[PDB]
Amino acid sequence: GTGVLTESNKKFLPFQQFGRDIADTTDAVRDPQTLEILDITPCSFGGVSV
């Protein structure tokens, strides 16, 4: 996927690796390397009006 990967203050249990959101979209993930909790936020977007 794409987007910013910030540091999350969640409480991922040792058996919970991935994580979804209200719309069943991946919002947080566990690093395959040394265990760390991340937060996957979408890239900067918006709308333009002329």
Partner: protein, 197 residues
């Protein structure tokens, strides 16, 4: 109390909540996430299995747009009705029953509300009724006398003329009763005396 204002908000909220829950529903593919079919299949199968999701999402978006159009038509009808009530109840007294409140309309005050308006209608509600003996007209000096604007009532022993919406006993004078015809054609005419000033 504010039932018809929360209904449109709940509808607009569920229309958005149901539009995002259908993105996790596979329309005939092996996955729902976009970056899953383009990472396990070949282009000859990717261009076939990914279109089945794009078509479903387009159909869902079209259904949402149609629901929004119907909701906007309903909101436009409600807004036209609200503008008509604002222009006929607040900007003047209207003689339309139930259009500016239940009862005799007198005045209207508008107030704002989240995505809506609230009209406070002042209504004239009569009460404390009383029975009286009525008659179409009376006969004095051989000629009939019909009320100009009022109603003939009788406290049993005397006949008075009152208003049509409020009791106000007044003597029958030659100022609110006109003469038209003789006393042989109206059914129910009573006798009395019309006192002239």
């Amino acid at each position: 109390a504010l039932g018809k204002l929360q209904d449109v908000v709940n509808h607009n909220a569920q229309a958005l909540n149901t539009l995002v829950k259908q993105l996790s529903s596979k329309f005939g593919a092996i996955s729902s996430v976009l970056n899953d079919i383009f990472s396990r299949l070949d282009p000859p199968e990717a261009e076939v299995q990914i279109d089945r999701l794009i078509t479903g999402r387009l159909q869902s978006l079209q259904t949402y747009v149609t629901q929004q159009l119907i909701r906007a038509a309903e909101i436009r009808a409600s807004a036209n009705l609200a503008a008509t009530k604002m222009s006929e109840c607040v900007l003047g007294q209207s003689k339309r029953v139930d259009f500016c409140g239940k009862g005799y309309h007198l005045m209207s005050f508008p107030q704002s509300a989240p995505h809506g308006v609230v009209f406070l209608h002042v209504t004239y509600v009569p009460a404390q009724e009383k029975n009286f003996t009525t008659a179409p007209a009376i006969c004095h000096d051989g000629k009939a006398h019909f009320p100009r604007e009022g109603v003939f009532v009788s406290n049993g022993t005397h006949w008075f003329v009152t208003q049509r919406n409020f009791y106000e006993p007044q003597i029958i004078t030659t100022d609110n009763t006109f003469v038209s015809g003789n006393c042989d054609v109206v059914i129910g005419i009573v006798n009395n005396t019309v006192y002239d000033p």
